[PDB]
Design a protein around this nucleic acid. Sequence first.
RNA 1: AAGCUCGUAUCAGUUUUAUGAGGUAAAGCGAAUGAUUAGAGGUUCCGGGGUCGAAAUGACCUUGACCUAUUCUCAAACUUUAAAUAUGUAAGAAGUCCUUGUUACUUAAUUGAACGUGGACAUUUGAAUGAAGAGCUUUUAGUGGGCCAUUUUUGGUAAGC
RNA 2: GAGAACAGAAAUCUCCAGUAGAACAAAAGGGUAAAAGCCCCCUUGAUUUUGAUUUUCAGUGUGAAUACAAACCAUGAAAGU
RNA 3: GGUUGCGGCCAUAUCUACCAGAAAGCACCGUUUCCCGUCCGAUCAACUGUAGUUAAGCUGGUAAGAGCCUGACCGAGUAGUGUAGUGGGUGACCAUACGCGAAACUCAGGUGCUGCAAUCU
Lengths: 169, 220, 159, 296
Amino acid sequence: QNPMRDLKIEKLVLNISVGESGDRLTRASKVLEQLSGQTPVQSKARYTVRTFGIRRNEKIAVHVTVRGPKAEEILERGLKVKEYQLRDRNFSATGNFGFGIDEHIDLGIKYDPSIGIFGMDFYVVMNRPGARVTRRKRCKGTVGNSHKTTKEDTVSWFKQKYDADVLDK
Amino acid sequence: ARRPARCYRYQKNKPYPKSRYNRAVPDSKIRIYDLGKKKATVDEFPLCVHLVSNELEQLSSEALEAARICANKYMTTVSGRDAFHLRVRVHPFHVLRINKMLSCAGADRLQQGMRGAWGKPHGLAARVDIGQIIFSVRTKDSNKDVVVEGLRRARYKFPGQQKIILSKKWGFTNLDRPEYLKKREAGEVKDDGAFVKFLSKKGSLENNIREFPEYFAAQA
Amino acid sequence: GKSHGYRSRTRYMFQRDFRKHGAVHLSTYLKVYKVGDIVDIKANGSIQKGMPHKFYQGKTGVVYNVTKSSVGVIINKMVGNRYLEKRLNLRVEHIKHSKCRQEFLERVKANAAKRAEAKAQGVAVQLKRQPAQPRESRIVSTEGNVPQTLAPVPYETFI
Amino acid sequence: AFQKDAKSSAYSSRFQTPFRRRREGKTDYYQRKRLVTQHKAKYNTPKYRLVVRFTNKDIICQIISSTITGDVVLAAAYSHELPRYGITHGLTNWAAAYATGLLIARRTLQKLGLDETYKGVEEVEGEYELTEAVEDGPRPFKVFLDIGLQRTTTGARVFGALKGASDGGLYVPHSENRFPGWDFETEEIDPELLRSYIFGGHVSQYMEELADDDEERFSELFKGYLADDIDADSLEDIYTSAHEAIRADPAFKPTEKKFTKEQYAAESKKYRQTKLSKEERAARVAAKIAALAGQQ
RNA sequence: AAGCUCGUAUCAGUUUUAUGAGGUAAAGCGAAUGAUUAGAGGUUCCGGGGUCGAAAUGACCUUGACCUAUUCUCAAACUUUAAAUAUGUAAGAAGUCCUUGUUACUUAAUUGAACGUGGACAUUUGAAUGAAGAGCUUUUAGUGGGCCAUUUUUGGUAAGC
RNA sequence: GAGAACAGAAAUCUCCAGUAGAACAAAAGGGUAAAAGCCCCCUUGAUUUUGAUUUUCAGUGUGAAUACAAACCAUGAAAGU
RNA sequence: GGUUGCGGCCAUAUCUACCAGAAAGCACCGUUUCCCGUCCGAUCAACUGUAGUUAAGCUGGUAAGAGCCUGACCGAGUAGUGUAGUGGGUGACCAUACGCGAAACUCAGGUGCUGCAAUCU
């Protein structure tokens, strides 16, 4: 029973939570921009904390969403940073996962002091076909519990391909 | 200084509790309601006597605390702590008011007659109907005289008429004595803390059979 | 110190029927209102335009006008020792027909048909209504229903 | 498969369910009120809506008025009945939409008695023109577009079917800024391009572009055209003749019903489950208590 | 007080029938919101404290918060529900039925809407009871400090307040 | 709630559940979910003309509000507002 | 009888969890030249019904299921209430007469019906 119960990446979300705006933020944006080929999008802080120097609507951070073979491309070159090794967690209860990296140069980008060094959060978000049902306008249904993604199925997929293990729990 | 209870005996005013509107009230003098052997199964204390009001009046938290102390002390003197479960089935929620018109001399320090006579809180009181139960005890059947005596001794510390009535029905609960017995025989009962849970014929058989295997199990 | 605004004392009135909030149903708008039709007034808090004042809640009037979105209702209002003719521009969400005169017109049709049938067959319909009359004589049989004797019960507490 | 949400008994008690078409996700009652409600001083005049819906494989254009017991259909045209006029592939595209609108217009006017007058545009060049009125005679049949939930956008097929209806003769008030060929800067229309969209110029342009760029995609796509001997030079003539025959005879010859209502009902009720009985529920309960008590 | 137009016209501090409106009394909170007594079973890497411990989302212990199902008790400014009394409308001649004119309004349309012609149904003509006449107008006096009782009810300990 | 470098009880991202437990300038109350809330686009009907109506009420005034007409505009695919 | 479109009344229709579905339809599904829209052809827009599957959505069934609906000499003619008395009672409050009359609890059953059109071994 696996005709269309095949698990595939909905998308990959690349995030950098730079803590301020100006040079650091726009440079992080450039990093994402030439990493993805897609014009990234800048998010703003949703309230004020004052321990960190962030407040409302200050253009705090950057992210971008990628899909398809470019998504799994960026994913494998970024997973090779973690050496095909995750934890028992890093995997959501719903069937997604993610991992953080430092020194993004590990994904093939020169130092280039006109950019500088940034970390990243990668989040892989998964699905089985028939997710239009939950996103389309007309007749927006749910997905049945058979066809809902799950942590176990997602881990089994990520294991049986990618040559990846779950060291460190 | 705490003017008498004849001044607040009768349900003259509407109920007036601690709210966002009326705030800044004094605490109750009765704060404990369950005492004796509270961590006791229903099967241990088959008796009950109730102290029932026979008047539509309102009682004070002070009187409730006093009656509580008196009754507990008598019960504990004779029968012991592990012998009874005194529950106070009434709660002082109605707030009482004072205008507080001064007491030295109203010639120049006038206090303004009845201008602005709305009062501030004085204390707390329970509004008690006729037939409304007060002071359940639930002992064993052989502590009957003691419980009657203790409730009758508490009875002096309230206004109005109160009656001490015997009960069937395992008196924490409803469900008369033989019916409780036949259900406990059939296995329709579980001992949850201080009060039981009863079988229903409504929920899923999953839950009913994991929670009540003895009922239709054919081994006993 | 007092407050006597338009929607004063209207809290529970213009509440909205538990589990009947929002999304007015469209038979309300498809219902047709001709001049002379009797209509009951029952405001809807969800439609803030064209509302009645709280006086006219549950009052039943007659239509004098018909407009785009509304109808004009006539009411007779007590002011002292008299009644006064009040005209209300109210939207149709606050308005419903009257099953009273509906039933009256049914009885009209039946009275006409009955009078016709009688003019054919047999005169003296007696087509008015009469109140509930006292019931006639009858015979109440035992034959299996013997009278069961009841006694007053003694006092018991069961508490 | 999940529990911690656990809709409680109180929640389920005081939950107000939406209307059924809303729960189904098929209707906007906001739009429906705004669109169905009539000026109450007309007292009886139906407000007719041209309901244009797009499934996969079919376009569904209906002329509907509203009533309490339920809406009533004056006329209804589909795309799947175009093969008797000469369209057999791409019968859910912009051009089939135009032709379906043309057909509902002509069919409606036929049965309504207003076909000799308000004959509509038979010189289709994309020039934006509504159906002006004829003095010394009736007015045209006014009918309002019901889209539903698909997004108002410039280049779309609800608008194709509208343009077809208006050309076919119906009065359908609309603006020209959602027909394709409308420029975001200069507020004017490109009716030559629009005529191309009517006559498949974009589909034909794509067939040419594949057939001289990529041939495997052209082989799997459009193979109905290859098999029916059609190529990308006479799609205009196809839709032209389809328009002409739609204008010739729109009178809705239906199917032949092929094992009629009773035979269908039998073959359905065979596989449609009976529900259950109360005694049967009691018996299954008895069986569960006996098995999960005695255990053989 | 003067009358005026009429003489069963139309009416009514009343019931019944039909149809509505209401959110008080009651009740309810193992239903929402707030208040509230008691234990019982789960629960954290994500509470505190101590133990076996160089560390381990490593092992154990008490209690608090949480959750689950129970549980005693409440609300003038809470409520799913929901009275009695009080309340609106109607109970046909200015009515119902059929055919058919006007319109500059409306309709896709002599389709609708309004007012109508013409014809048909009358004395159990469309519940009850009563109707010491019904309807209409003008003008003008005194008054514009109130008090009591039953019942509902606020303030106040209460008051011949 | 579960997940993701620095990231921690709270910073940004993703999914889940979520009948409103939020917000709607300002009291409180009502009302509102492909919304009356949040975001975006276009705008000035917050215009003109003078009348009928509802509340307060003497059935006066003011204040506010309602529903139309004759115009002119905005909006949108349009119904409509 | 099923399905689609458009609906009416708006839970007997909602929710949790399992199981089935022939035909047709719906659906997922395939690609991005053109209109169109996004950080992302995911949503939206368009093009093919071609390459594929009922996996989901969808419909129906199941559950001593939760919820909701109806009924009940079920509680209960109880609570409450209109009217009455030179009635009882220190009072608080109560009974009685002529009347109207609930909610919770309990039990039983039930779990969408239906209009217009089009189509389906």
